[PDB]
Design a protein around this nucleic acid. Structure first.
Lengths: 139, 59, 117, 113, 101
RNA sequence: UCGGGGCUUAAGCCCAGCGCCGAAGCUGCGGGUCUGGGGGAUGACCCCAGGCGGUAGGGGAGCGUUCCCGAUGCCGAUGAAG
RNA sequence: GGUGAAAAGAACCCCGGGAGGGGAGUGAAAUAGAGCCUGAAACCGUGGGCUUACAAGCAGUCACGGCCCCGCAAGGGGUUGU
């Protein structure tokens, strides 16, 4: 046998920055706690998604040319597959979907909007009227 | 006999759920002013009755 | 001679029945159904013997890799670090004396780095 | 004690009077009486009558007094039935039933101390 | 204080004085188990390219045993194949002594 | 809608490199199995080389059931079968 | 096709209109009480112990956990959230 029970390892309140950078490497590790890609399987809410809240606040730029349309989607975590929250028409859908693609780009929809909604907004604009951990694994 | 004939057999679950939507609901009774009886609301109790007093033959 | 078919049937019947008790559905209230679902359950059990082993392989690999990330490098490097040097065993799982005891962990990390760097 | 009293092999189908049982199940004598007395039903004053049955045995055969006698259970099953053949148009002869009940009204202890 | 050991295609982290089983052994029922192997200790105790051979780990054994039978009941889904069996894995119980390394 | 997300010093292509991952297939440990050999006078048991995908179908084998023997018997009120 | 060994087949009294019950006596036995040896399952019910209202389902299985009750120990029942 073997035992690797860690109980509640307690919340890691990181909030990394690279908002100016990438569009996919804009995940993977930023994933590991997010997805444009990473963790699904009927459980990982917008929640830990937030955290980072791309606390870097918002949008920025693009790698290729598929501009004039997005703010971003699919693959986040929890039930209906993977999870997200779609695009720009949803800049509207409650609060705005920037490179927070990743997080407040996933998110603004009323339903993961269940997933408490409850961890984000232009809150995430680094005021996030709160407190986190400002080494924030900047890297 | 004609067309809508039970495709398959229903489950006891859904059976007594369909049943579950009907928990037998109790009636309503308030006391009579100057007696001991639970008359239905607004209604005069069989005996006693209302103000002015009438009937009084429900032994 | 008439062999009065008596309780043999009912006994193996309620043998399988007894095996069933713990499920939902009329399977957990029918004989011929319990039976079949139990067959399926057995298949599942074997599958999950071998696959228990393999999914364990998965988790081992995972948290060893994640610890490796939390420090410096990653998995593949880790492995050739052990494998090349000479340490031909470790039982990957046994390395889970890692977060449980980060000390010996860090040192052995330096082993893998040492004899393969 | 737990006063046991019953009246088996009588009418009403399971569903109805089983709901009549779990209508007042867990509520003292007074209320029970006045309720069964006042319900748009058959099992109302019916199960009230078997309640009378239960009332005697606990008052003048168990002796626990009517003021301490609260509604203790009532389980009330299905029993046998009545299997009739119904005439119904186009040569159809069908099987239709009358289901029954096992009204086990019990009454019991008050405070407990 | 721990210690690692590769016993019977099963490798472990054994403590100094507890624990209850291994693979089925051709070893004495209730007497002396000298483990001519070893692969750790406590406060730093690296394993070499081969085993750890500064010395050895020591176990006591408290009798043999069998553990939870599994009915290998694997059937096939159509044209007959209902294999109803059940293997009970035979093993040997222990309880260590120390880790003289 | 490429599984999907998503990817532009690639996460696409070309060429080289080392590393891992990763099957009931292989190593170790443990159990069964039938077989072949030898000790086995030995029955046993022990050791040794090897196969086990398996439907029809071949073949060995193993549980149970009414009743005849065992019986002018044995268990059974301290309690028979179901 | 079945109460018992035999009717000794439940007298007197309490709820009811009775039907049925509730105390009795009786007999070893009253879940032997009048359709009365056994009395499975299907199927229908009572309390209570455990779960389930963010959820995509051949409903089972594997690792873990939370709960209730057996276990001196380790353990175990089973409930089934991930």
């Amino acid at each position: 046998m073997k035992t690797y029970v860690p109980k509640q390892v307690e919340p890691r309140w990181v909030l990394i920055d690279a908002e100016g950078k990438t569009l996919g490497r804009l995940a993977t590790k930023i994933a590991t706690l997010l997805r444009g890609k990473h963790r699904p399987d009927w459980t990982p809410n917008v929640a830990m998604g937030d955290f980072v809240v791309v606390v870097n606040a918002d949008k920025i730029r693009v790698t290729g040319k598929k501009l004039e349309q997005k703010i971003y989607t699919r693959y986040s975590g929890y039930p209906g597959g993977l999870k997200k929250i779609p695009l720009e028409k949803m800049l509207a859908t409650h609060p705005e979907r920037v490179l927070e693609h990743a997080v407040k780009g996933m998110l603004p929809k009323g339903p993961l909007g269940r997933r408490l909604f409850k961890r984000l907004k232009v809150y995430a604009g680094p005021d996030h009227p709160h407190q986190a951990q400002r080494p924030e694994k900047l890297e | 006999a004609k067309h809508p004939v039970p495709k398959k057999k229903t489950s006891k679950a859904r059976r007594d759920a369909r049943r579950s939507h009907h928990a037998l609901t109790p009636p309503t009774l308030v006391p009579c002013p100057e007696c001991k009886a639970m008359k239905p609301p607004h209604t005069v109790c069989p005996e006693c009755g209302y103000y002015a007093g009438r009937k009084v033959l429900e032994v | 001679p008439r062999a009065k078919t008596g309780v043999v049937r009912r006994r193996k019947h309620k043998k399988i029945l007894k095996l069933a008790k713990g499920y939902w559905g009329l399977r957990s209230k029918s004989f011929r159904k319990a039976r079949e679902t139990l067959f399926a359950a057995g298949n599942y059990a074997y599958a999950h013997r071998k696959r228990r082993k393999r999914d364990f392989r998965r988790l081992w690999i995972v948290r060893i890799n994640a610890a490796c990330r939390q420090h410096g490098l990653n998995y593949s490097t880790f492995i050739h670090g052990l494998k090349k040097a000479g340490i031909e065993v470790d039982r990957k799982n046994l390395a889970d004396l890692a977060v449980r005891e980060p000390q010996v962990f860090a040192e052995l990390v330096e082993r893998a780095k040492a004899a393969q760097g | 004690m737990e006063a046991k009293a019953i009246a088996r092999y009588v009418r009403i189908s399971p569903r109805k009077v089983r709901l009549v049982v779990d209508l007042i199940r867990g509520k003292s004598l007074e209320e029970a009486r006045n309720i069964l007395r006042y319900t748009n039903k058959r099992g109302a004053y019916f199960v009230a009558k078997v309640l009378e049955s239960a009332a005697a045995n606990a008052v003048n055969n168990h002796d626990m007094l009517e003021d301490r006698l609260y509604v203790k259970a009532a389980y009330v099953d299905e029993g046998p039935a009545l299997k009739r053949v119904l005439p119904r148009a186009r040569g159809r002869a069908d099987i239709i039933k009358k289901r029954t009940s096992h009204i086990t009204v019990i009454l019991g202890e008050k405070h407990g101390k | 204080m721990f210690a690692i050991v590769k016993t019977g295609g099963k490798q472990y982290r054994v403590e100094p004085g507890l624990k209850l089983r291994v693979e089925k052994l051709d070893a004495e029922p209730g007497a002396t188990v000298e483990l001519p192997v070893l692969l750790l200790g406590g406060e730093k105790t690296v394993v070499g390219t081969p085993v750890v051979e500064g010395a050895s780990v020591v176990a006591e054994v408290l009798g043999h045993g069998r553990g939870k039978k599994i009915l290998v009941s694997k059937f096939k889904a159509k044209v007959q194949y209902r294999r109803k069996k059940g293997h009970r894995q035979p093993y040997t119980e222990l309880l260590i002594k120390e880790i003289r390394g």
